[PDB]
Design a protein around this ligand. Structure first.
Ligand SMILES: OC[C@H]1O[C@H](O[C@H]2[C@H](O)[C@@H](O)[C@@H](O[C@H]3[C@H](O)[C@@H](O)[C@@H](O[C@H]4[C@H](O)[C@@H](O)[C@@H](O[C@H]5[C@H](O)[C@@H](O)[C@@H](O)O[C@@H]5CO)O[C@@H]4CO)O[C@@H]3CO)O[C@@H]2CO)[C@H](O)[C@@H](O)[C@@H]1O
Ligand SMILES: OC[C@H]1O[C@H](O[C@H]2[C@H](O)[C@@H](O)[C@@H](O)O[C@@H]2CO)[C@H](O)[C@@H](O)[C@@H]1O
Ligand SMILES: OC[C@H]1O[C@H](O[C@H]2[C@H](O)[C@@H](O)[C@@H](O)O[C@@H]2CO)[C@H](O)[C@@H](O)[C@@H]1O
Ligand SMILES: [Ca+2]
Length: 854
């Protein structure tokens, strides 16, 4: 034919002229037409480089077409000679006559082609299309139906929106109005097999499958085998990488243990036991300490019934500390410190009975909640402030406000009684306490450059723990608002015991904590125990009008007090209000010369063939340290890499009694993630390189750091992250439904969507996944065949090592949190049929394209 408008057709019906996502078309994609024109008269053939946005030629509706014309004419594509002025476009809409809309749009292309020629390229055009798309709900985030759009929405301080989710469902339809995404089908996706609902018959926890990101299908047997591969890798990291051969993790902090199929917890425990013979051998289990993150108390029962392959996280203790000591006002009673925990500590004088647990005063999430609460307070007219309207500037402002508030007596945001919270945590029996990096150091400065105001107090408590803390515990109210927590010492079971150990006499501790700042002055009597009669005690910490003292400087008590013939210590006490104490804090330890370590070796405790972790004096001797913050800044040099700073300070951590070092998730971070912290990762096996370090450093430094920590006598755990990945660069056509965090369909302001093709980012994993994914499975099966014959609870089938995951995609994913791309990107014809390009391996339908590009 002669030249004309038919040259709007695609240059060819394949991926060389039409961009596509598994054969589907996107309105925001581009194609190569056969030719183009600036006037309707002369037509030039496209070269292979002359591509054009589909939105110049097709639209999801009349309405959107009218908006496209309106928008472009009002943003630099006005031309009176082609019937396109601000007026004339002024009142066109979906009810404008169809042939005048087509004609306006054809003339607009001529005007756009003049702009392209005038600007020698498509760059301005490309930005004008993106700006336009953002104004159209179905081509942008708002059609995804965020809960943030509800009227009078109150942002959540967590900084994630739980019920902003989509599930990936099966779709092998031949109906072109439904489409087909069968390559993302799964016979698994068993969702919410969490905690006690592992078998699908006990949802008393109601713990959600979905949190944030691309949620991984930990019910898929192939994925379960890949987690074993990943654990094995991390447990042998250094020698598998040819880096420091002693640079191998000893255990795991299990991220989101409440939000993944519980099979993987069983499986991790099984692996650890096969490799290291942990079950029934306290020495081995405790050398490979592992502990599960979670905020659901039902996990205690779950872990006990399983013989405790990991520690339970005692979140109730954390909330009790904050509600009793940490609020400004409406503090719960002091006695709640005794009872409101997974362990009652009123008179705890037995071993191997309590739920093996870890406890904390702060972690990175709790600091985050506080900073976000501040951000939300400071910027209250933005309902999507925790979503896409979040700005790092608001966090910086919040941190400036936080550090200032932390130093005050009358704190508006930061916690009260941080030292007293630690004094309780670090003396408690039947727990592995966890100290937070950000309570020892100003967490937004370069790594370990600035000590926190609480550094002196917490470190004093930490060193004293190693020296003195052991034996039975008794907590008792001295008055309605004041309590004494007493440890009786190594081999001293209870208040009536004489002591069975050479260190019995010179160990034990009394911690006095009150939470009423107006408490009247009074004398109090503390029962140190019958092993501690006529004994000198040092005033380790006492309260003053302005703060704390470590040498009894201007406190109510002297540097030494002495118990009577019954072992009673008499002490003066009162209410104070200063930056360190709102109420009272006092700590007493026996006088010694000089050095003492009450650590109970695991060889000397009762072993139980049915248990892995047991709560006894040997487990109690451990202390965990969380080495990171979410607000930890990017390093400014190799010397400031957290891994190098840590390696340099290895002996310090040992001196403080830390036995188990919790390292940040070390994985390659998604660059555009909010915090660059490692939970939002693109590669599970790349822990950074010299040229491209993570926030924390390179893999080579990590291995050296782990070896340095090992040389100082510590064990090291990795934050392992089975729940999600975030930052895939590969889009996939996936069939989805709008759900809450348990994958149940919901409405949002009366609207919803189900079984829709959505172009989710799902595919990736980096060269790490390509190289290391499933690499160790043949050897795991050779040495430990039981891993791949033990039938999982949730599925009824063993993990499957015959498939290697070299690349992640939707078929291994339960779904994703809303990706902020839009639910209407997928091109549909007038009749509702999905457009489809049959070409290559995309054979679901015959080629069906919009008539505009025929
Ligand atoms: O747009 C393409 C992109 O879409 C998807 O990712 C985006 C998410 O949909 C979106 O929500 C947003 O994600 C943010 C998140 O909103 C924000 O809160 C922050 O997430 C942090 C948590 O704040 C932080 O607490 C931590 O959470 C852990 C927690 O430590 C742990 O103790 C326990 O609670 O489990 C949590 C999960 O392991 O880490 C997360 C992760 O960093 O930051 C997120 C990322 O900035 O933005 C996403 C990216 O654009 C898809 O998933 C992605 O593949 C696509 O590329
Ligand atoms: O005008 C923008 C952009 O167009 C072309 O990009 C094509 C690319 O050639 C295709 O392989 C595929 O990725 O689709 C793209 C459509 O945006 C040009 O090649 C490129 O130089 C130019 O900037
Ligand atoms: O945010 C940029 C970049 O910061 C960090 O890289 C540092 C690097 O560690 C230093 O040695 C030095 O070269 O400066 C770089 C930044 O200017 C992070 O390691 C990296 O993840 C991050 O992308
Ligand atoms: Ca999950």
């Amino acid at each position: 034919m002669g030249p004309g408008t038919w040259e709007n057709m695609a240059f060819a019906q394949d991926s060389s002229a039409i961009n596509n996502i598994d054969g589907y078309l996107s309105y925001t994609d581009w194609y190569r037409p056969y030719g183009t024109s600036q006037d309707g008269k002369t037509w030039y053939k496209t070269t292979a480089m002359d591509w054009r946005p589909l939105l110049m030629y097709i639209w999801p509706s009349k309405d959107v077409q009218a908006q496209f014309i309106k928008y472009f004419v009002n943003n630099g594509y006005e031309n009176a000679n082609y019937g396109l002025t601000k007026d004339t476009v002024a009142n066109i809409n979906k009810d404008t006559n169809t042939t005048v809309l087509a004609n306006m749009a054809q003339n607009l292309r001529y005007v756009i082609e003049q702009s392209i020629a005038a600007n020698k390229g498509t760059s301005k055009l490309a930005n004008d299309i993106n700006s336009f798309a953002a104004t159209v709900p179905e081509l942008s985030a708002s059609s995804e139906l965020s809960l943030q759009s509800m009227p009078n929405y109150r942002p959540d301080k967590s900084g994630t929106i739980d019920s902003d989710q989509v599930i990936f469902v099966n779709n092998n339809s031949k109906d072109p109005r439904k489409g087909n995404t069968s390559y993302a089908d799964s016979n698994y996706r068993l969702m919410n097999r969490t905690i006690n609902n592992q078998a699908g018959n006990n949802n008393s926890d109601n713990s959600p499958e979905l949190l944030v990101g691309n949620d991984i299908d930990n019910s898929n047997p192939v994925v379960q085998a890949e987690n074993l591969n990943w654990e094995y890798f991390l447990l042998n990291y250094g020698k598998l990488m040819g880096y420091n051969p002693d640079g191998n993790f000893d255990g795991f902090r299990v991220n989101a243990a409440d939000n993944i199929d519980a099979d993987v917890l069983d499986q991790m425990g099984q692996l650890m036991n096969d490799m290291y013979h942990t079950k029934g051998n306290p020495q081995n289990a405790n050398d490979h300490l592992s502990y599960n993150e979670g905020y659901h108390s039902g996990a205690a029962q779950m872990l006990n019934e399983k013989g405790n392959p990991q520690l339970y996280m005692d979140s109730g203790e954390f909330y009790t500390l904050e509600n009793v000591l940490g609020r400004a006002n409406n503090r719960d009673n002091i006695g709640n410190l005794i009872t409101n925990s997974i362990v009652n500590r009123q008179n705890d004088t037995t071993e191997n009975e309590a739920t093996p647990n870890w406890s904390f005063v702060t972690n990175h999430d709790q600091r985050k909640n506080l900073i976000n609460r501040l951000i939300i307070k400071d910027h209250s007219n933005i309902p999507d402030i925790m979503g896409s309207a979040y700005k790092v500037e608001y966090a910086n402002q919040a941190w400036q406000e936080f550090y200032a508030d932390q130093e005050k007596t009358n704190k508006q945001y930061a916690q009260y009684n941080v030292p007293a919270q630690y004094a309780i945590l670090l003396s408690n029996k039947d727990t592995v306490p966890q100290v937070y990096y950000g309570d020892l150091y100003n967490e937004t400065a370069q790594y370990m450059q600035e000590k926190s105001i609480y550094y002196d107090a917490i470190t004093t408590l930490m060193r004293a723990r190693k020296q003195f803390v052991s034996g039975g515990q008794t907590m008792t109210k001295l008055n309605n608002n004041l309590l004494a927590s007493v440890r009786y010492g190594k081999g001293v079971v209870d208040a009536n015991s004489n002591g069975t150990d050479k260190l019995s006499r010179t160990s034990g501790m009394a911690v006095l904590v009150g939470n009423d700042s107006n408490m009247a002055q009074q004398s109090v009597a503390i029962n140190m125990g019958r092993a501690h009669a006529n004994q000198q005690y040092r005033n380790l910490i006492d309260t003053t009008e302005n703060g704390l003292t470590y040498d009894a400087d201007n406190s109510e008590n002297p540097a030494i007090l002495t118990t009577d013939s019954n072992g009673i210590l008499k002490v003066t006490v009162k209410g104070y209000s200063n930056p360190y104490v709102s109420g009272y804090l006092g700590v007493w330890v026996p006088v010694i010369s000089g050095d003492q370590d009450v650590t109970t070796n695991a060889s000397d405790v009762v072993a139980n063939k049915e248990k892995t972790f047991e709560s006894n004096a040997a487990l109690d001797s451990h202390m965990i340290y969380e080495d990171f913050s979410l607000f930890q800044p990017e390093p400014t040099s190799v010397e400031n890499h957290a891994y190098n700073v840590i390696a340099k300070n290895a002996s310090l951590f040992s001196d403080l009694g830390i036995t188990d070092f919790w390292m940040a998730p070390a994985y390659t971070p998604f660059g555009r993630s909010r915090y660059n912290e490692g939970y939002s990762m693109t590669d599970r096996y790349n822990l950074g390189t010299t040229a491209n370090p993570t926030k924390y450093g390179s893999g080579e430094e990590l291995a050296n750091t782990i070896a340095a920590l090992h040389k100082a006598g510590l064990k090291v755990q990795e934050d392992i992250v089975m729940n999600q990945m975030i930052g895939f660069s590969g889009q996939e056509a996936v069939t989805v439904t709008r759900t809450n965090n348990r994958g149940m369909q919901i409405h949002v302001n009366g609207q919803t969507y189900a079984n829709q093709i959505y172009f989710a980012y799902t595919t990736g994993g980096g060269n790490g996944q390509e190289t290391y994914g499933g690499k160790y499975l043949a050897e795991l099966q050779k040495n430990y065949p039981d891993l791949f014959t033990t039938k999982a609870i949730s599925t009824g089938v063993a993990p499957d090592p015959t498939v290697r995951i070299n690349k992640w995609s939707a078929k291994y994913q339960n779904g994703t949190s809303l990706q902020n791309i839009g639910i209407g990107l997928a091109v549909k014809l007038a009749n509702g049929d999905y457009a489809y390009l049959n070409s290559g391996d995309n054979k679901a339908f015959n080629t069906l394209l919009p008539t505009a590009i025929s």
